[PDB]
Design an enzyme around this catalytic site. Structure first.
Site, PDB file in Angstrom:
ATOM      1  N   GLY A  15       0.806  -1.203   0.000  1.00  0.00           N
ATOM      2  CA  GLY A  15       0.000   0.000   0.000  1.00  0.00           C
ATOM      3  C   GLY A  15       0.839   1.252   0.000  1.00  0.00           C
ATOM      4  N   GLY A  17       0.876   5.153   1.941  1.00  0.00           N
ATOM      5  CA  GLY A  17       0.294   6.055   2.931  1.00  0.00           C
ATOM      6  C   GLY A  17       0.664   7.497   2.638  1.00  0.00           C
ATOM      7  N   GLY A  20       4.588   7.713   3.032  1.00  0.00           N
ATOM      8  CA  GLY A  20       5.437   6.626   2.564  1.00  0.00           C
ATOM      9  C   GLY A  20       4.698   5.330   2.291  1.00  0.00           C
ATOM     10  N   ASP A 133     -12.636  11.141  11.433  1.00  0.00           N
ATOM     11  CA  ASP A 133     -12.508  10.677  10.038  1.00  0.00           C
ATOM     12  C   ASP A 133     -12.987   9.215   9.928  1.00  0.00           C
ATOM     13  OD1 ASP A 133     -11.829  10.805   7.297  1.00  0.00           O
ATOM     14  OD2 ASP A 133      -9.673  10.408   7.666  1.00  0.00           O
ATOM     15  N   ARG A 137     -13.087   3.366   4.488  1.00  0.00           N
ATOM     16  CA  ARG A 137     -11.684   3.328   4.096  1.00  0.00           C
ATOM     17  C   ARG A 137     -10.714   3.291   5.273  1.00  0.00           C
ATOM     18  NH1 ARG A 137     -10.792   8.960   4.957  1.00  0.00           N
ATOM     19  NH2 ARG A 137     -12.909   9.866   4.593  1.00  0.00           N
ATOM     20  N   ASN A 138     -11.178   3.728   6.440  1.00  0.00           N
ATOM     21  CA  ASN A 138     -10.383   3.688   7.676  1.00  0.00           C
ATOM     22  C   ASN A 138     -10.646   2.493   8.596  1.00  0.00           C
ATOM     23  OD1 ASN A 138      -8.599   5.819   7.239  1.00  0.00           O
ATOM     24  ND2 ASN A 138     -10.059   7.376   8.034  1.00  0.00           N
ATOM     25  N   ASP A 151      -6.520   4.862  11.670  1.00  0.00           N
ATOM     26  CA  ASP A 151      -6.297   6.265  11.330  1.00  0.00           C
ATOM     27  C   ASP A 151      -6.430   7.142  12.566  1.00  0.00           C
ATOM     28  OD1 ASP A 151      -7.511   8.828   8.996  1.00  0.00           O
ATOM     29  OD2 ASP A 151      -5.578   8.564   9.920  1.00  0.00           O
TER      30      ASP A 151
END
Ligand SMILES: NC(=O)c1cccc(Nc2nccc(Nc3c(Cl)ccc4c3OCO4)n2)c1
Ligand SMILES: [Mg+2]
Ligand SMILES: [Mg+2]
Ligand SMILES: [Mg+2]
Length: 274
Positions: A15, A17, A20, A133, A137-138, A151
């Site tokens: 993945g 981020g 990085g 948030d 997706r988190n 997250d």
């Protein structure tokens, strides 16, 4: 916990981020069995403020211990690259995992996922931590389909700081939190209703192609997302409850978990669909 870099083997980049790469790897420390880990790396070219922001996610995660919150294993800070190591979640982000598996999990499985997220949020709210948030997706998913909140960060959103943590995620954010920047566990409950919708829609985008301003206006004008295809009415009603304009009327997370537990025990109730 500072981890000796000799204890870490990076196996594959899985993945990307903010700062990085995200990698899969193995952690083996004296006296403990080897375990699979996820590894976030921060390589050269970063400012110290950026290093502090990167590592703040570790500091925050390390404050928590719950089966539905991503577990911190440690950090590597005395060498480069700087790393954060956590438990590994084989199935990655929930929204993409669900899109890959569209229509392939049962309503009871989906309710179990939602229950896990809700328990994680129950815990965070008990700890007086506001996520800000909360979005599919988190949420990360392991091999057994256990869902965990990820997250973590405490930086204000761009709109909260100088006139001149990223932007407020408008589609997930409660109207009072957009308007006044008052983020609370009750605004997280609004976001959680959006996550419910994402899960029952197998990862569709909340509000499809509506613009951010279109979403803000719609919600102010009483629009709420409709039940996803095949969604039990009881689940849609819980979403609507999460989306009450009056934050104090929204269910708190213990009540959300309770409602979901009742559904699981009474699966006949989930048969009623529009
Ligand atoms: N799309 C992906 O990156 C991905 C794909 C497949 C599996 C996983 N799995 C996966 N499992 C655990 C954590 C993460 N990502 C992550 C997070 Cl979210 C926060 C902090 C941190 C992380 O790794 C270590 O430090 N990922 C992530
Ligand atoms: Mg955040
Ligand atoms: Mg975020
Ligand atoms: Mg669909």
């Amino acid at each position: 916990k500072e981890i000796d870099v000799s204890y870490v083997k990076i196996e594959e980049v899985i993945g990307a981020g903010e700062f990085g790469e995200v990698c899969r790897g193995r952690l083996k420390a004296p006296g403990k069995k080897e375990s699979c880990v996820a590894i976030k790396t921060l390589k050269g070219g970063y400012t110290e403020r950026q290093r502090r922001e990167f590592l703040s996610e570790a500091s925050i995660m390390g404050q928590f211990e719950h089966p539905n919150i991503i577990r911190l294993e440690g950090v590597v800070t005395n060498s480069m690259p700087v790393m954060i190591l956590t438990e590994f979640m084989e199935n990655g982000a929930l929204d993409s995992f669900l899109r890959l598996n569209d229509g392939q999990f049962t309503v009871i499985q989906l309710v179990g996922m939602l229950r896990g997220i809700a328990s994680g949020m129950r815990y965070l709210a008990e700890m007086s931590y506001v996520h800000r948030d909360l979005a599919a997706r988190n949420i990360l998913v392991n091999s057994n389909l256990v869902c965990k909140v990820s997250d973590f960060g405490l930086s204000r959103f761009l709109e909260e700081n100088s006139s001149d943590g990223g932007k407020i995620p408008i589609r997930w954010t409660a109207p009072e939190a957009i308007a006044f920047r008052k983020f609370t566990s009750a605004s997280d409950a609004w976001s959680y209703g959006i996550v419910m919708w994402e899960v029952m829609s197998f990862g569709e985008r909340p509000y499809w192609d509506m613009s951010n301003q279109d979403v803000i206006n719609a919600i102010e004008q009483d629009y709420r997302l409709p039940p996803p295809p095949d969604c039990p009415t009881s689940l849609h009603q819980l979403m609507l409850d999460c989306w009450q304009k009056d934050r104090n009327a929204r269910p708190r997370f213990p009540q959300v978990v309770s409602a979901l537990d009742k559904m699981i025990r009474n699966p006949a109730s989930l048969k009623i669909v529009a």
